[PDB]
Amino acid sequence: QPKLLNCQLKEYQLKGLNWLVNLYEQGINGILADEMGL
């Protein structure tokens, strides 16, 4: 995780970060649609 973060991402959020990164580095946009309060 990026060392600029204060509080650690939980495991399901780190996989969500990786998805968001891979969206960016491949030039495609996305909808992050996981359930409220996640």
Side-chain angles (χ1 to χ4, degrees):
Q1 66 166 18
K3 294 291 186 177
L4 305 184
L5 292 171
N6 178 269
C7 190
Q8 304 199 359
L9 293 169
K10 295 184 183 296
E11 174 56 24
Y12 81 95
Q13 297 175 314
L14 184 58
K15 293 291 296 186
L17 172 61
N18 291 359
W19 178 78
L20 299 157
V21 169
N22 297 347
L23 282 182
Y24 175 81
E25 294 182 351
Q26 302 170 4
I28 54 169
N29 293 321
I31 308 188
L32 183 58
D34 46 341
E35 194 172 54
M36 307 81 81
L38 303 185

Coordinates of all heavy atoms in Angstrom, one line a residue:
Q1 N 0.8 -1.2 0.0 CA 0.0 0.0 0.0 C 0.9 1.3 0.0 O 2.0 1.2 0.5 CB -0.9 0.0 1.2 CG -0.2 0.1 2.5 CD -1.2 0.4 3.7 OE1 -2.4 0.2 3.6 NE2 -0.6 0.9 4.8
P2 N 0.3 2.3 -0.6 CA 1.1 3.6 -0.6 C 1.4 4.1 0.8 O 0.5 4.4 1.6 CB 0.2 4.5 -1.4 CG -1.1 4.0 -1.3 CD -1.0 2.5 -1.2
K3 N 2.7 4.4 1.0 CA 3.1 4.8 2.4 C 2.6 6.1 2.8 O 2.8 6.5 4.0 CB 4.7 4.8 2.4 CG 5.3 3.5 2.2 CD 5.1 2.6 3.4 CE 5.9 1.3 3.3 NZ 5.7 0.4 4.5
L4 N 1.9 6.8 1.9 CA 1.2 8.0 2.4 C 0.0 7.8 3.2 O -0.6 8.7 3.8 CB 0.8 8.8 1.1 CG 1.9 9.2 0.1 CD1 1.3 10.1 -1.0 CD2 3.0 10.0 0.9
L5 N -0.5 6.5 3.2 CA -1.7 6.2 4.0 C -1.4 6.1 5.5 O -0.3 5.6 5.9 CB -2.3 4.8 3.6 CG -2.9 4.8 2.2 CD1 -3.2 3.4 1.7 CD2 -4.1 5.7 2.1
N6 N -2.3 6.7 6.3 CA -2.2 6.6 7.8 C -2.6 5.3 8.3 O -1.9 4.6 9.1 CB -3.0 7.8 8.4 CG -3.0 7.8 9.9 OD1 -3.8 7.2 10.5 ND2 -2.0 8.4 10.5
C7 N -3.9 4.9 8.0 CA -4.4 3.7 8.6 C -4.5 2.6 7.5 O -4.8 2.9 6.3 CB -5.8 3.9 9.1 SG -6.5 2.5 10.1
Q8 N -4.2 1.4 7.9 CA -3.9 0.3 6.9 C -5.2 -0.2 6.3 O -6.2 -0.4 6.9 CB -3.3 -0.9 7.7 CG -2.0 -0.5 8.4 CD -1.1 -1.7 8.7 OE1 -1.5 -2.8 8.4 NE2 0.0 -1.5 9.3
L9 N -5.1 -0.3 4.9 CA -6.2 -0.9 4.2 C -6.4 -2.4 4.6 O -5.4 -3.1 4.8 CB -5.9 -0.9 2.7 CG -5.9 0.5 2.0 CD1 -5.3 0.5 0.6 CD2 -7.3 1.1 2.0
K10 N -7.7 -2.8 4.7 CA -8.0 -4.1 5.0 C -7.9 -5.0 3.7 O -7.9 -4.5 2.6 CB -9.4 -4.2 5.6 CG -9.5 -3.6 7.0 CD -10.8 -3.7 7.6 CE -10.8 -3.0 9.0 NZ -9.9 -3.6 9.9
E11 N -7.8 -6.3 3.9 CA -7.4 -7.2 2.8 C -8.3 -7.1 1.6 O -7.8 -7.0 0.5 CB -7.4 -8.7 3.3 CG -7.2 -9.7 2.3 CD -6.0 -9.5 1.5 OE1 -5.0 -8.9 2.0 OE2 -5.9 -10.0 0.3
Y12 N -9.6 -7.0 1.8 CA -10.5 -6.8 0.7 C -10.4 -5.5 0.0 O -10.8 -5.3 -1.1 CB -12.0 -7.1 1.1 CG -12.7 -6.0 1.8 CD1 -13.5 -5.1 1.1 CD2 -12.6 -5.8 3.2 CE1 -14.1 -4.0 1.7 CE2 -13.2 -4.8 3.8 CZ -14.0 -3.9 3.1 OH -14.6 -2.8 3.7
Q13 N -9.9 -4.5 0.7 CA -9.7 -3.1 0.2 C -8.4 -3.1 -0.6 O -8.3 -2.3 -1.6 CB -9.7 -2.1 1.2 CG -11.1 -2.0 1.9 CD -11.1 -1.0 3.0 OE1 -10.2 -1.0 3.9 NE2 -12.1 -0.1 3.1
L14 N -7.3 -3.8 -0.2 CA -6.1 -3.9 -0.9 C -6.3 -4.5 -2.3 O -5.7 -4.1 -3.3 CB -5.0 -4.6 -0.1 CG -3.6 -4.7 -0.8 CD1 -3.1 -3.3 -1.0 CD2 -2.7 -5.4 0.2
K15 N -7.1 -5.6 -2.4 CA -7.5 -6.1 -3.7 C -8.3 -5.1 -4.5 O -8.3 -5.2 -5.7 CB -8.3 -7.4 -3.5 CG -7.4 -8.6 -2.9 CD -6.4 -9.1 -4.0 CE -7.1 -9.6 -5.2 NZ -6.1 -10.2 -6.2
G16 N -9.0 -4.3 -3.8 CA -9.8 -3.2 -4.5 C -8.9 -2.1 -5.0 O -9.1 -1.6 -6.1
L17 N -7.8 -1.8 -4.2 CA -6.8 -0.9 -4.7 C -6.1 -1.4 -6.0 O -5.9 -0.7 -7.0 CB -5.8 -0.6 -3.6 CG -4.5 0.1 -4.0 CD1 -4.8 1.5 -4.6 CD2 -3.5 0.2 -2.9
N18 N -5.7 -2.7 -6.0 CA -5.0 -3.3 -7.1 C -5.9 -3.3 -8.4 O -5.4 -3.0 -9.5 CB -4.7 -4.7 -6.8 CG -3.5 -4.8 -5.8 OD1 -3.0 -3.8 -5.3 ND2 -3.1 -6.0 -5.4
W19 N -7.2 -3.5 -8.2 CA -8.2 -3.4 -9.3 C -8.2 -2.0 -9.9 O -8.1 -1.7 -11.1 CB -9.6 -3.8 -8.9 CG -10.6 -3.7 -10.0 CD1 -10.8 -4.5 -11.0 CD2 -11.6 -2.7 -10.1 NE1 -11.9 -4.1 -11.8 CE2 -12.4 -2.9 -11.2 CE3 -11.9 -1.5 -9.3 CZ2 -13.5 -2.1 -11.6 CZ3 -13.0 -0.7 -9.7 CH2 -13.8 -1.0 -10.8
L20 N -8.2 -1.0 -9.0 CA -8.2 0.4 -9.4 C -6.9 0.8 -10.1 O -6.9 1.6 -11.1 CB -8.5 1.3 -8.2 CG -9.8 1.1 -7.4 CD1 -9.7 1.5 -6.0 CD2 -11.0 1.7 -8.2
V21 N -5.8 0.3 -9.6 CA -4.5 0.6 -10.2 C -4.5 0.0 -11.6 O -4.1 0.6 -12.6 CB -3.3 0.0 -9.3 CG1 -2.1 0.0 -10.1 CG2 -3.2 0.8 -8.1
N22 N -4.9 -1.3 -11.7 CA -4.8 -2.0 -13.0 C -5.8 -1.4 -14.0 O -5.6 -1.4 -15.2 CB -5.1 -3.5 -12.9 CG -4.1 -4.2 -12.0 OD1 -3.0 -3.6 -11.7 ND2 -4.4 -5.4 -11.6
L23 N -6.9 -0.8 -13.6 CA -7.7 0.1 -14.4 C -7.0 1.2 -15.0 O -7.0 1.5 -16.2 CB -8.9 0.6 -13.6 CG -10.2 -0.3 -13.3 CD1 -11.1 0.5 -12.6 CD2 -10.8 -0.9 -14.6
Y24 N -6.2 2.0 -14.1 CA -5.5 3.1 -14.5 C -4.4 2.8 -15.5 O -4.3 3.4 -16.6 CB -4.9 3.8 -13.3 CG -4.0 5.0 -13.6 CD1 -4.5 6.3 -13.9 CD2 -2.6 4.9 -13.6 CE1 -3.7 7.3 -14.2 CE2 -1.8 5.9 -13.9 CZ -2.4 7.2 -14.2 OH -1.5 8.3 -14.4
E25 N -3.5 1.8 -15.2 CA -2.4 1.5 -16.0 C -2.8 0.8 -17.3 O -1.9 0.6 -18.2 CB -1.4 0.6 -15.2 CG -0.8 1.2 -14.0 CD 0.2 0.3 -13.3 OE1 0.2 -0.9 -13.6 OE2 0.9 0.8 -12.4
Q26 N -4.0 0.5 -17.5 CA -4.5 -0.1 -18.8 C -5.5 0.9 -19.5 O -6.2 0.4 -20.4 CB -5.1 -1.4 -18.6 CG -4.1 -2.4 -17.9 CD -4.7 -3.7 -17.5 OE1 -5.9 -4.0 -17.7 NE2 -3.9 -4.6 -16.9
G27 N -5.6 2.1 -19.0 CA -6.4 3.1 -19.7 C -7.9 3.0 -19.8 O -8.5 3.5 -20.7
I28 N -8.4 2.3 -18.8 CA -9.9 2.0 -18.7 C -10.4 2.6 -17.4 O -9.7 2.5 -16.4 CB -10.2 0.5 -18.9 CG1 -9.4 -0.3 -17.9 CG2 -9.9 0.1 -20.3 CD1 -9.9 -1.8 -17.8
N29 N -11.6 3.0 -17.4 CA -12.3 3.5 -16.2 C -13.1 2.4 -15.6 O -13.4 1.4 -16.2 CB -13.1 4.7 -16.5 CG -12.3 5.9 -16.9 OD1 -11.2 6.2 -16.3 ND2 -12.8 6.7 -17.8
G30 N -13.6 2.7 -14.3 CA -14.4 1.7 -13.6 C -15.3 2.3 -12.6 O -15.3 3.4 -12.3
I31 N -16.3 1.4 -12.2 CA -17.2 1.7 -11.2 C -16.8 0.9 -9.9 O -16.9 -0.4 -10.0 CB -18.7 1.4 -11.6 CG1 -19.0 2.0 -12.9 CG2 -19.7 1.8 -10.5 CD1 -20.4 1.9 -13.3
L32 N -16.4 1.5 -8.9 CA -16.2 0.8 -7.6 C -17.6 0.8 -6.9 O -18.1 1.8 -6.4 CB -15.2 1.5 -6.8 CG -14.8 0.9 -5.4 CD1 -14.4 -0.6 -5.7 CD2 -13.8 1.6 -4.7
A33 N -18.2 -0.4 -6.8 CA -19.6 -0.6 -6.5 C -19.9 -1.4 -5.3 O -21.0 -1.8 -5.1 CB -20.3 -1.2 -7.7
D34 N -18.8 -1.7 -4.5 CA -19.0 -2.5 -3.3 C -19.9 -1.9 -2.3 O -20.2 -0.7 -2.3 CB -17.6 -2.8 -2.7 CG -16.7 -1.6 -2.6 OD1 -17.0 -0.6 -3.3 OD2 -15.8 -1.6 -1.8
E35 N -20.5 -2.7 -1.4 CA -21.7 -2.4 -0.6 C -21.4 -1.4 0.5 O -20.2 -1.2 1.0 CB -22.2 -3.7 0.1 CG -23.5 -3.6 0.7 CD -24.1 -4.9 1.2 OE1 -23.3 -5.6 2.0 OE2 -25.2 -5.3 0.8
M36 N -22.4 -0.6 0.8 CA -22.3 0.6 1.6 C -21.6 0.3 3.0 O -22.0 -0.8 3.6 CB -23.7 1.2 1.8 CG -24.4 1.5 0.6 SD -25.2 0.1 -0.1 CE -26.7 0.0 0.8
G37 N -20.8 1.1 3.4 CA -20.0 1.0 4.7 C -18.7 0.1 4.5 O -17.9 0.2 5.4
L38 N -18.6 -0.7 3.5 CA -17.3 -1.1 3.0 C -16.6 0.1 2.4 O -17.1 0.8 1.6 CB -17.4 -2.2 2.0 CG -18.2 -3.5 2.3 CD1 -18.1 -4.5 1.2 CD2 -17.7 -4.0 3.6

